[PDB]
Short mmCIF file of C-alpha atoms and ligand atoms in Angstrom, two decimals:
data_model
loop_
_atom_site.label_atom_id
_atom_site.label_comp_id
_atom_site.label_asym_id
_atom_site.label_seq_id
_atom_site.Cartn_x
_atom_site.Cartn_y
_atom_site.Cartn_z
CA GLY A 1 43.97 79.53 112.81
CA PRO A 2 43.36 77.38 115.91
CA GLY A 3 46.41 76.56 117.92
CA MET A 4 48.86 78.00 120.42
CA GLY A 5 48.63 81.58 121.60
CA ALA A 6 51.11 83.74 119.65
CA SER A 7 51.11 87.01 121.57
CA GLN A 8 54.38 88.70 122.54
CA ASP A 9 53.98 87.35 126.08
CA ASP A 10 53.94 83.83 124.58
CA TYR A 11 57.43 84.26 123.07
CA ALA A 12 60.65 83.15 124.76
CA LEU A 13 63.26 85.53 123.29
CA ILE A 14 61.77 88.98 124.01
CA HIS A 15 64.36 89.99 126.61
CA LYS A 16 67.45 88.36 125.06
CA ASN A 17 70.17 90.67 123.60
CA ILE A 18 72.80 90.18 120.91
CA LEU A 19 75.26 92.32 122.91
CA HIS A 20 76.62 90.59 125.95
CA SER A 21 76.44 93.77 128.07
CA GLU A 22 73.13 95.39 129.01
CA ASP A 23 75.25 98.27 130.33
CA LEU A 24 76.86 98.70 126.88
CA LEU A 25 73.52 98.89 125.09
CA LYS A 26 72.31 101.54 127.56
CA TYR A 27 75.60 103.43 127.17
CA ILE A 28 75.09 103.55 123.39
CA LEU A 29 71.51 104.74 123.70
CA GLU A 30 72.19 107.40 126.38
CA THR A 31 75.45 108.73 124.88
CA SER A 32 74.95 108.44 121.14
CA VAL A 33 71.27 107.95 120.34
CA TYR A 34 68.84 109.77 122.62
CA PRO A 35 70.72 113.12 122.25
CA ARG A 36 70.37 112.70 118.44
CA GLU A 37 66.80 111.38 118.31
CA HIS A 38 64.08 113.61 116.83
CA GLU A 39 61.57 114.69 119.48
CA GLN A 40 58.77 113.03 117.49
CA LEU A 41 60.80 109.80 117.23
CA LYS A 42 61.16 109.94 121.01
CA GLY A 43 57.41 110.29 121.52
CA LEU A 44 56.62 107.53 119.04
CA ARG A 45 59.13 105.19 120.67
CA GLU A 46 57.73 105.92 124.13
CA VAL A 47 54.14 105.10 123.10
CA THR A 48 55.29 102.00 121.20
CA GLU A 49 57.30 100.72 124.21
CA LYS A 50 53.94 100.33 126.02
CA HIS A 51 52.27 98.54 123.08
CA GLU A 52 51.49 94.86 123.07
CA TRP A 53 53.92 94.20 120.19
CA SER A 54 56.74 96.40 121.52
CA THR A 55 59.26 93.60 120.78
CA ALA A 56 58.90 94.32 117.07
CA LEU A 57 59.90 98.01 117.42
CA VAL A 58 63.16 98.76 115.57
CA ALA A 59 65.98 99.62 117.96
CA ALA A 60 66.77 103.32 118.33
CA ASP A 61 70.49 102.91 117.58
CA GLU A 62 69.53 100.98 114.46
CA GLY A 63 67.24 103.91 113.62
CA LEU A 64 70.13 106.39 113.52
CA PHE A 65 72.13 103.92 111.49
CA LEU A 66 69.44 103.52 108.83
CA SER A 67 69.16 107.33 108.69
CA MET A 68 72.93 107.59 108.10
CA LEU A 69 72.87 105.07 105.25
CA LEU A 70 69.99 106.90 103.56
CA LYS A 71 71.77 110.25 103.78
CA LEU A 72 75.16 108.95 102.72
CA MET A 73 73.69 107.24 99.66
CA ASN A 74 71.50 110.29 98.89
CA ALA A 75 68.38 108.13 98.77
CA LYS A 76 65.31 109.78 97.34
CA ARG A 77 62.73 107.05 96.73
CA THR A 78 62.35 104.20 99.19
CA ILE A 79 60.05 101.33 100.08
CA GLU A 80 59.41 100.01 103.57
CA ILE A 81 57.90 96.58 104.20
CA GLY A 82 56.58 96.35 107.76
CA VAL A 83 55.65 99.72 109.25
CA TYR A 84 54.13 98.87 112.68
CA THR A 85 53.79 102.17 114.58
CA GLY A 86 56.17 103.95 112.16
CA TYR A 87 59.59 104.36 113.84
CA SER A 88 61.77 103.30 110.93
CA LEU A 89 59.26 105.00 108.61
CA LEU A 90 59.54 108.30 110.46
CA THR A 91 63.32 107.87 110.62
CA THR A 92 63.33 107.35 106.85
CA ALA A 93 61.06 110.28 106.06
CA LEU A 94 63.15 112.61 108.23
CA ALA A 95 66.30 111.42 106.43
CA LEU A 96 65.07 111.92 102.86
CA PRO A 97 65.02 115.25 100.98
CA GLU A 98 61.90 117.45 101.17
CA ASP A 99 60.59 115.93 97.94
CA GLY A 100 61.59 112.36 98.85
CA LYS A 101 58.94 109.64 98.59
CA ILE A 102 58.30 106.41 100.52
CA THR A 103 56.04 103.50 99.65
CA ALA A 104 55.12 102.01 103.05
CA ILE A 105 53.35 98.63 103.20
CA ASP A 106 51.74 96.99 106.23
CA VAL A 107 48.80 94.64 106.74
CA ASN A 108 47.68 96.61 109.80
CA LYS A 109 46.97 100.30 109.36
CA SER A 110 45.77 100.59 112.96
CA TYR A 111 49.40 100.27 114.09
CA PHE A 112 50.31 102.99 111.60
CA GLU A 113 47.61 105.25 113.07
CA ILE A 114 49.42 105.13 116.44
CA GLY A 115 52.54 106.77 115.03
CA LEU A 116 50.80 108.95 112.46
CA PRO A 117 50.30 111.97 114.82
CA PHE A 118 54.04 112.00 115.53
CA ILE A 119 54.82 111.74 111.80
CA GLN A 120 52.43 114.62 111.13
CA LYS A 121 53.97 116.81 113.83
CA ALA A 122 57.42 116.09 112.36
CA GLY A 123 56.22 117.65 109.12
CA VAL A 124 57.02 114.73 106.81
CA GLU A 125 53.73 112.83 106.40
CA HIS A 126 53.60 114.17 102.82
CA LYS A 127 56.46 111.88 101.79
CA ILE A 128 54.63 108.68 102.72
CA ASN A 129 52.31 106.61 100.57
CA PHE A 130 50.89 104.01 102.96
CA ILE A 131 49.45 100.82 101.44
CA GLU A 132 47.33 98.63 103.74
CA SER A 133 47.96 95.16 102.34
CA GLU A 134 50.00 92.04 102.50
CA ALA A 135 53.33 93.04 101.00
CA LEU A 136 53.77 90.22 98.49
CA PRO A 137 50.77 91.17 96.27
CA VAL A 138 51.86 94.82 96.30
CA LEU A 139 55.39 93.87 95.23
CA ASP A 140 54.11 91.64 92.43
CA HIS A 141 51.85 94.45 91.23
CA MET A 142 54.86 96.76 91.29
CA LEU A 143 56.94 94.40 89.15
CA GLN A 144 54.28 94.65 86.42
CA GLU A 145 53.91 98.47 86.51
CA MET A 146 57.39 99.60 87.60
CA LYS A 147 59.50 101.57 85.11
CA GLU A 148 63.31 101.49 85.10
CA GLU A 149 63.32 105.24 85.82
CA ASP A 150 61.36 104.76 89.07
CA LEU A 151 63.31 101.95 90.76
CA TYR A 152 63.73 102.48 94.51
CA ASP A 153 67.01 103.67 96.01
CA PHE A 154 66.48 101.82 99.26
CA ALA A 155 64.22 99.11 100.70
CA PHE A 156 63.80 98.30 104.39
CA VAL A 157 62.36 94.85 105.04
CA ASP A 158 61.05 94.35 108.55
CA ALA A 159 57.70 92.60 108.17
CA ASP A 160 56.95 88.86 108.44
CA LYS A 161 60.37 87.21 108.75
CA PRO A 162 59.62 83.79 107.15
CA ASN A 163 58.73 85.63 103.92
CA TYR A 164 62.02 87.56 103.51
CA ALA A 165 63.39 85.17 100.86
CA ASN A 166 60.15 85.74 98.92
CA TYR A 167 60.45 89.54 99.22
CA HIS A 168 64.09 89.35 98.09
CA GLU A 169 63.11 87.81 94.75
CA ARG A 170 60.98 90.90 94.01
CA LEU A 171 63.14 93.51 95.66
CA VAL A 172 66.27 92.67 93.66
CA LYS A 173 64.17 93.86 90.69
CA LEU A 174 62.43 96.82 92.33
CA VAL A 175 65.58 98.50 93.69
CA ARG A 176 68.02 100.14 91.30
CA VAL A 177 71.44 98.76 90.51
CA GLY A 178 73.59 100.19 93.29
CA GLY A 179 70.55 100.56 95.55
CA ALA A 180 70.25 98.98 98.99
CA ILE A 181 67.98 96.34 100.49
CA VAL A 182 68.21 96.10 104.29
CA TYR A 183 66.75 93.02 105.99
CA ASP A 184 66.04 93.55 109.67
CA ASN A 185 66.46 90.93 112.42
CA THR A 186 68.87 88.61 110.58
CA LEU A 187 70.61 87.58 113.82
CA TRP A 188 67.23 86.72 115.49
CA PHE A 189 68.33 87.17 119.12
CA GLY A 190 71.50 85.21 118.32
CA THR A 191 69.60 81.95 117.92
CA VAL A 192 70.72 81.72 114.27
CA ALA A 193 74.16 80.71 115.53
CA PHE A 194 72.84 77.29 116.64
CA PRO A 195 71.54 74.33 114.59
CA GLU A 196 68.88 73.78 117.24
CA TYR A 197 67.78 75.99 120.06
CA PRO A 198 65.45 74.66 122.78
CA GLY A 199 62.62 76.56 124.40
CA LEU A 200 61.31 78.69 121.52
CA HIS A 201 57.76 79.48 120.60
CA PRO A 202 56.98 77.74 117.27
CA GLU A 203 56.90 81.13 115.49
CA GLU A 204 60.26 82.04 117.03
CA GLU A 205 61.67 78.69 115.91
CA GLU A 206 60.31 79.16 112.38
CA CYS A 207 62.13 82.52 112.18
CA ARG A 208 65.36 81.02 113.48
CA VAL A 209 65.20 78.44 110.70
CA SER A 210 64.08 81.03 108.11
CA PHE A 211 67.00 83.35 108.93
CA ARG A 212 69.55 80.56 108.93
CA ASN A 213 68.35 79.77 105.38
CA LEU A 214 68.17 83.44 104.34
CA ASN A 215 71.65 84.27 105.65
CA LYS A 216 73.15 81.40 103.62
CA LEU A 217 71.12 82.42 100.55
CA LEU A 218 72.13 86.08 100.75
CA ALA A 219 75.81 85.18 101.25
CA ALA A 220 75.61 83.00 98.11
CA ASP A 221 73.54 85.37 95.92
CA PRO A 222 75.62 86.85 93.05
CA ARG A 223 73.04 89.58 92.37
CA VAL A 224 74.02 91.48 95.54
CA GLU A 225 76.95 92.29 97.73
CA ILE A 226 76.20 92.00 101.46
CA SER A 227 77.25 93.22 104.87
CA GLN A 228 75.70 91.67 107.98
CA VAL A 229 75.81 94.17 110.86
CA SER A 230 75.42 93.25 114.54
CA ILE A 231 73.29 96.29 115.42
CA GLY A 232 69.85 96.07 117.03
CA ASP A 233 68.80 92.46 116.35
CA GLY A 234 71.14 92.19 113.38
CA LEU A 235 70.52 93.44 109.90
CA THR A 236 71.91 92.58 106.50
CA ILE A 237 72.62 95.32 103.95
CA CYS A 238 72.38 94.16 100.34
CA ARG A 239 73.62 96.24 97.38
CA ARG A 240 72.22 95.29 93.98
CA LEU A 241 74.98 94.50 91.46
CA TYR A 242 72.90 93.81 88.35
CA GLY B 1 112.46 100.99 129.58
CA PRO B 2 114.85 98.68 127.75
CA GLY B 3 113.77 95.08 127.37
CA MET B 4 111.61 92.91 125.11
CA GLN B 5 100.17 92.76 123.65
CA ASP B 6 100.10 90.17 126.44
CA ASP B 7 100.65 93.00 128.99
CA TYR B 8 97.14 94.14 128.06
CA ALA B 9 93.74 93.31 129.46
CA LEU B 10 91.89 93.92 126.14
CA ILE B 11 92.85 91.22 123.63
CA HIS B 12 89.55 89.71 122.35
CA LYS B 13 87.23 91.78 120.12
CA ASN B 14 83.71 90.55 120.79
CA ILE B 15 80.97 92.79 122.17
CA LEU B 16 78.43 90.16 121.14
CA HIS B 17 76.61 87.78 123.46
CA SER B 18 78.69 84.71 122.64
CA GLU B 19 81.76 83.71 120.72
CA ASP B 20 79.40 81.45 118.76
CA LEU B 21 77.34 84.35 117.39
CA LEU B 22 80.41 86.25 116.17
CA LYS B 23 81.89 83.12 114.60
CA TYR B 24 78.54 82.50 112.92
CA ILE B 25 78.54 86.00 111.39
CA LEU B 26 82.11 85.54 110.17
CA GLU B 27 81.63 82.07 108.66
CA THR B 28 78.14 82.70 107.24
CA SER B 29 78.41 86.24 106.00
CA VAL B 30 82.04 87.44 105.94
CA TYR B 31 84.54 84.76 104.91
CA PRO B 32 82.50 83.68 101.79
CA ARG B 33 82.51 87.35 100.66
CA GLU B 34 86.16 88.11 101.53
CA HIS B 35 88.68 88.68 98.73
CA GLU B 36 91.41 86.01 98.59
CA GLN B 37 94.10 88.65 99.24
CA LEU B 38 92.17 89.97 102.27
CA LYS B 39 92.00 86.39 103.59
CA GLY B 40 95.75 85.99 103.09
CA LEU B 41 96.53 89.33 104.71
CA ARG B 42 94.28 88.53 107.67
CA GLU B 43 95.84 85.10 108.17
CA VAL B 44 99.41 86.43 108.26
CA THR B 45 98.31 89.30 110.53
CA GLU B 46 96.61 86.98 113.04
CA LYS B 47 100.13 85.69 113.73
CA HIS B 48 101.62 89.17 114.25
CA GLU B 49 102.43 90.37 117.75
CA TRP B 50 99.88 93.22 117.49
CA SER B 51 97.12 91.15 115.90
CA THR B 52 94.50 92.48 118.35
CA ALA B 53 94.78 95.79 116.44
CA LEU B 54 93.58 94.12 113.22
CA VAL B 55 90.21 95.52 112.12
CA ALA B 56 87.35 93.07 112.61
CA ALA B 57 86.53 91.33 109.37
CA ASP B 58 82.77 91.93 109.62
CA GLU B 59 83.60 95.61 110.15
CA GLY B 60 85.76 95.50 107.04
CA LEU B 61 82.92 94.21 104.89
CA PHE B 62 80.70 96.94 106.29
CA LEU B 63 83.24 99.66 105.45
CA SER B 64 83.33 98.25 101.91
CA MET B 65 79.52 98.49 101.69
CA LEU B 66 79.47 102.06 103.00
CA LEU B 67 82.10 103.16 100.46
CA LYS B 68 80.15 101.68 97.56
CA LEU B 69 76.76 103.00 98.67
CA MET B 70 78.11 106.53 98.96
CA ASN B 71 80.07 106.23 95.67
CA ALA B 72 83.27 107.30 97.44
CA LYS B 73 86.25 108.07 95.18
CA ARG B 74 88.85 109.84 97.37
CA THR B 75 89.56 108.59 100.85
CA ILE B 76 91.98 109.04 103.71
CA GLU B 77 93.01 106.33 106.14
CA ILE B 78 94.74 107.16 109.41
CA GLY B 79 96.25 104.04 110.94
CA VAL B 80 97.06 101.34 108.39
CA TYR B 81 98.91 98.63 110.39
CA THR B 82 99.26 95.63 107.99
CA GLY B 83 96.66 97.06 105.58
CA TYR B 84 93.39 95.11 106.00
CA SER B 85 91.07 98.12 106.10
CA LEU B 86 93.26 99.81 103.46
CA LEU B 87 93.01 96.85 101.06
CA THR B 88 89.28 96.62 101.80
CA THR B 89 88.96 100.29 100.85
CA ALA B 90 91.13 100.01 97.72
CA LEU B 91 89.09 97.02 96.49
CA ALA B 92 85.84 98.87 97.13
CA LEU B 93 86.74 102.09 95.29
CA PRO B 94 86.36 102.49 91.52
CA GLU B 95 89.40 101.93 89.34
CA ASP B 96 90.31 105.62 89.55
CA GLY B 97 89.87 105.80 93.33
CA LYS B 98 92.60 107.45 95.37
CA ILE B 99 93.58 106.82 98.99
CA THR B 100 95.86 108.83 101.25
CA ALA B 101 97.09 106.29 103.83
CA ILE B 102 99.01 107.45 106.91
CA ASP B 103 100.85 105.37 109.51
CA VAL B 104 103.90 105.90 111.70
CA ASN B 105 105.21 102.41 110.95
CA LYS B 106 105.83 101.44 107.33
CA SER B 107 107.17 98.01 108.35
CA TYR B 108 103.62 96.93 109.25
CA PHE B 109 102.34 98.17 105.87
CA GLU B 110 105.06 96.14 104.14
CA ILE B 111 103.53 92.98 105.62
CA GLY B 112 100.34 93.74 103.71
CA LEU B 113 101.87 95.30 100.60
CA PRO B 114 102.30 92.00 98.63
CA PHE B 115 98.60 91.20 99.01
CA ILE B 116 97.64 94.73 97.95
CA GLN B 117 99.91 94.34 94.90
CA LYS B 118 98.54 90.89 94.04
CA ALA B 119 95.03 92.32 94.43
CA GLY B 120 95.97 94.86 91.72
CA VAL B 121 95.09 98.05 93.64
CA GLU B 122 98.46 99.34 94.84
CA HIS B 123 98.09 102.14 92.24
CA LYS B 124 95.23 103.63 94.28
CA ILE B 125 97.33 104.09 97.41
CA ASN B 126 99.60 106.95 98.50
CA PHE B 127 101.19 105.65 101.71
CA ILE B 128 102.76 108.28 103.97
CA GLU B 129 105.02 107.25 106.85
CA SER B 130 104.45 109.89 109.49
CA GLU B 131 102.51 110.79 112.56
CA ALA B 132 99.14 111.75 111.11
CA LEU B 133 98.62 115.14 112.84
CA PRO B 134 101.47 116.93 110.95
CA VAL B 135 100.29 115.45 107.66
CA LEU B 136 96.70 116.64 108.12
CA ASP B 137 97.79 120.11 109.21
CA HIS B 138 100.02 120.32 106.13
CA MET B 139 97.10 119.22 103.94
CA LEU B 140 94.92 121.96 105.42
CA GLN B 141 97.34 124.70 104.37
CA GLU B 142 97.50 123.34 100.81
CA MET B 143 94.30 121.54 99.81
CA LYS B 144 91.56 123.24 97.76
CA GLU B 145 87.88 122.38 97.52
CA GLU B 146 88.55 120.01 94.60
CA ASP B 147 90.87 117.95 96.82
CA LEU B 148 88.35 117.25 99.61
CA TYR B 149 87.95 113.61 100.61
CA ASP B 150 84.69 111.63 100.45
CA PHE B 151 85.52 109.35 103.36
CA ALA B 152 88.02 109.09 106.22
CA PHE B 153 88.70 105.99 108.30
CA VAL B 154 90.30 106.73 111.67
CA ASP B 155 91.94 103.72 113.30
CA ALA B 156 95.23 105.04 114.74
CA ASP B 157 96.29 106.28 118.22
CA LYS B 158 93.06 106.50 120.18
CA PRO B 159 93.87 109.50 122.44
CA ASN B 160 94.37 111.67 119.29
CA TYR B 161 90.95 110.95 117.75
CA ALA B 162 89.41 114.26 118.91
CA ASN B 163 92.46 116.01 117.47
CA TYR B 164 92.01 114.12 114.18
CA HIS B 165 88.31 115.10 114.13
CA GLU B 166 89.10 118.82 114.13
CA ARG B 167 91.19 118.43 110.95
CA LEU B 168 88.92 115.87 109.26
CA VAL B 169 85.74 117.93 109.53
CA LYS B 170 87.65 120.35 107.26
CA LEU B 171 89.33 117.77 104.96
CA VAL B 172 86.20 115.70 104.25
CA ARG B 173 83.60 117.23 101.95
CA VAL B 174 80.16 118.31 103.08
CA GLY B 175 78.04 115.18 103.06
CA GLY B 176 81.14 112.96 103.34
CA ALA B 177 81.81 110.41 106.08
CA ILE B 178 84.29 110.25 108.92
CA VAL B 179 84.37 106.80 110.53
CA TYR B 180 86.05 106.20 113.91
CA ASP B 181 87.03 102.65 114.84
CA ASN B 182 86.98 101.31 118.42
CA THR B 183 84.55 103.83 119.98
CA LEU B 184 83.16 101.09 122.25
CA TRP B 185 86.72 100.07 123.28
CA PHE B 186 86.01 96.42 124.24
CA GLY B 187 82.89 97.48 126.18
CA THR B 188 84.89 99.44 128.77
CA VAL B 189 83.33 102.79 127.82
CA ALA B 190 80.08 101.66 129.48
CA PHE B 191 81.65 102.12 132.93
CA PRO B 192 82.97 105.18 134.81
CA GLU B 193 85.70 102.95 136.31
CA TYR B 194 87.05 99.69 134.98
CA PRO B 195 89.48 97.45 136.89
CA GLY B 196 92.77 95.97 135.82
CA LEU B 197 93.40 97.85 132.59
CA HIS B 198 96.86 98.61 131.34
CA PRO B 199 97.62 102.34 131.76
CA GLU B 200 97.39 102.80 127.97
CA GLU B 201 94.10 100.89 127.76
CA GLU B 202 92.65 103.00 130.58
CA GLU B 203 93.79 106.17 128.81
CA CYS B 204 91.90 105.03 125.71
CA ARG B 205 88.79 104.24 127.77
CA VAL B 206 88.80 107.80 129.14
CA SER B 207 89.54 109.35 125.74
CA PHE B 208 86.72 107.42 124.07
CA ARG B 209 84.24 108.35 126.78
CA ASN B 210 85.22 111.98 126.12
CA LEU B 211 85.15 111.56 122.32
CA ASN B 212 81.76 109.86 122.26
CA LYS B 213 80.23 112.75 124.18
CA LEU B 214 82.00 115.31 121.96
CA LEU B 215 80.73 113.71 118.72
CA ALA B 216 77.18 113.35 120.08
CA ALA B 217 77.23 117.11 120.83
CA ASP B 218 78.98 118.28 117.65
CA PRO B 219 76.60 120.35 115.44
CA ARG B 220 79.00 120.08 112.49
CA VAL B 221 78.13 116.39 111.98
CA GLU B 222 75.39 113.85 112.35
CA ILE B 223 76.39 110.50 113.84
CA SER B 224 75.56 106.85 114.19
CA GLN B 225 77.45 104.68 116.66
CA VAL B 226 77.32 101.06 115.46
CA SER B 227 77.87 98.04 117.71
CA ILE B 228 79.93 96.13 115.10
CA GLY B 229 83.44 94.83 115.76
CA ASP B 230 84.84 97.06 118.52
CA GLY B 231 82.27 99.74 117.73
CA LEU B 232 82.51 102.37 115.11
CA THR B 233 81.03 105.84 114.90
CA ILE B 234 80.06 107.14 111.48
CA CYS B 235 79.97 110.92 111.15
CA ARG B 236 78.50 112.78 108.19
CA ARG B 237 79.66 116.37 107.72
CA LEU B 238 76.76 118.84 107.68
CA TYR B 239 78.63 122.07 106.83
N1 LIG C 1 52.53 89.79 105.08
C1 LIG C 1 52.70 91.02 105.58
N2 LIG C 1 52.67 92.09 104.73
C2 LIG C 1 52.86 93.39 105.16
N3 LIG C 1 53.05 93.64 106.50
C3 LIG C 1 53.08 92.58 107.36
C4 LIG C 1 52.91 91.27 106.94
N4 LIG C 1 53.00 90.46 108.02
C5 LIG C 1 53.21 91.22 109.12
N5 LIG C 1 53.25 92.53 108.71
C6 LIG C 1 53.50 93.73 109.51
O1 LIG C 1 54.91 93.85 109.69
C7 LIG C 1 55.16 94.67 110.81
C8 LIG C 1 56.43 94.13 111.46
S1 LIG C 1 57.04 95.13 112.83
C9 LIG C 1 57.72 96.49 111.79
C10 LIG C 1 58.55 97.43 112.69
C11 LIG C 1 58.84 98.84 112.16
N6 LIG C 1 59.61 98.84 110.91
C12 LIG C 1 59.61 99.66 113.18
O2 LIG C 1 60.44 100.49 112.75
O3 LIG C 1 59.40 99.56 114.41
C13 LIG C 1 53.90 94.61 111.68
O4 LIG C 1 53.36 95.92 111.76
C14 LIG C 1 52.96 93.67 110.92
O5 LIG C 1 51.62 94.10 110.90
N1 LIG C 2 100.27 109.22 115.44
C1 LIG C 2 100.04 108.26 114.55
N2 LIG C 2 99.93 108.59 113.23
C2 LIG C 2 99.70 107.64 112.26
N3 LIG C 2 99.58 106.33 112.63
C3 LIG C 2 99.67 105.99 113.93
C4 LIG C 2 99.91 106.94 114.92
N4 LIG C 2 99.96 106.29 116.11
C5 LIG C 2 99.77 104.97 115.90
N5 LIG C 2 99.61 104.77 114.55
C6 LIG C 2 99.34 103.52 113.83
O1 LIG C 2 97.97 103.23 113.94
C7 LIG C 2 97.78 101.84 113.66
C8 LIG C 2 96.65 101.28 114.53
S1 LIG C 2 96.15 99.62 114.04
C9 LIG C 2 95.31 100.06 112.47
C10 LIG C 2 94.46 98.88 111.97
C11 LIG C 2 94.18 98.84 110.48
N6 LIG C 2 93.42 100.02 110.07
C12 LIG C 2 93.50 97.52 110.13
O2 LIG C 2 92.70 97.47 109.20
O3 LIG C 2 93.76 96.46 110.74
C13 LIG C 2 99.14 101.15 113.85
O4 LIG C 2 99.64 100.70 112.59
C14 LIG C 2 100.04 102.27 114.37
O5 LIG C 2 101.37 102.17 113.87
O1 LIG C 3 96.25 99.52 120.19
C1 LIG C 3 95.59 98.53 120.20
C2 LIG C 3 94.38 98.41 119.28
C3 LIG C 3 93.42 97.46 119.60
C4 LIG C 3 92.30 97.33 118.80
C5 LIG C 3 92.14 98.14 117.69
O2 LIG C 3 91.03 98.01 116.85
C6 LIG C 3 93.08 99.08 117.37
O3 LIG C 3 92.83 99.84 116.22
C7 LIG C 3 94.22 99.24 118.16
MG1 LIG C 4 62.87 94.48 113.09
MG1 LIG C 5 90.77 99.49 115.34
#
């Protein structure tokens, strides 16, 4: 639509961190992440860091953390909403068993095509079913065809942040009891801690407001237990109770 | 010598950008989800002379999530203090869950014991008053494959963590988790030198810098260091 430019260079928050120490974040990455990062993850991250939407790239320490959750819960079937160039998707596919399966949904397959050669070299493209679409129609179509036996173990939600509350209403039915839904970016550069925050792009401000509403909603939702984790840009792990 | 936590440079646990962000996480996402007996235990512990030791409450809720997601049933805790992470664990486990809890100081555990009892989960806990290293070595001579733990939380004397790790990678099952608290040690690990630390705090800075490298290099586990609370490192045993 007509209006203000909404490129990454038009945003205010790009360089802001949720850790107070830039040195600490680099310590974590150099000590505990890069030595443990798959060579194809490294290549995909390095190409994505140059891309015009590099701000959206999941953080590499968050990557290893998502991998750990998947392995510890023995996830086998997962859904990812918001693929971009494929870092969390490649992380997920490397974590799952050889016969694991991922439903991966993104409006923009051209982004996916950037990471695809890395995912192919890693030997795990066969686990991925990529759907080029807005996520909400796909999720609604799943609700009508999904069997109890095929509920997902794990969902990673990282797409268009104002829609998370809408995705949640479907995902609490598409993930198994005991399964996990992980919402990325729920601390939104730390701006969620303030009732108003000057200087934001209108899309940044909409996400600040969206996440303040989502974080209250998830804390109050009896269908899940939650843990909000100050890693990357914040994430909230939800475990379906019924 | 003879005489009488204020001697220490590291008293506030917040690696986040602002005190406001951490408070927001706690009020929005932790306190509404915190069991009444955890709230009571935390509030009495905040008045204890070693309250800085108390596990961060957002970290507690995350431990609880991890335990449930991995369906843990048998756990070991090294370093109990007043029992916040222990009560968190006992509330997270199924009714038949079992915890081996080890601390040198039972008087601290007795501060938390009434809340654990009121919470109805004392039956899950075998508390052992001892330095942990002898206990783990004794367990290694005796335990069989059926007695392996699903999960270990390590939150005791920081310079001994690498020593604990060598026992725990044998006492935790393949695929189980070993979780180390405080591996970012108030942010000090990010620096090769750090001014003004108490001799014990500096010793922990050095030991954590050594431990973090060791765990990153250890082929027996995979890891994830997580910038929550004072940092924790989750290890999953590979073989
Ligand atoms: N309505 C919608 N439905 C599905 N995908 C959407 C969407 N709106 C935006 N997206 C996609 O969501 C993605 C968010 S960035 C995703 C980052 C990725 N998980 C990583 O690990 O780096 C973008 O690729 C964008 O194209
Ligand atoms: N060698 C050792 N063996 C077992 N416990 C030890 C120890 N050295 C120190 N400790 C104990 O380790 C604890 C660290 S504080 C533990 C915090 C607790 N897990 C919480 O949730 O708040 C103290 O209670 C201390 O008494
Ligand atoms: O010894 C002091 C201490 C300080 C912080 C901690 O988290 C801890 O476990 C111990
Ligand atoms: Mg994200
Ligand atoms: Mg601790």
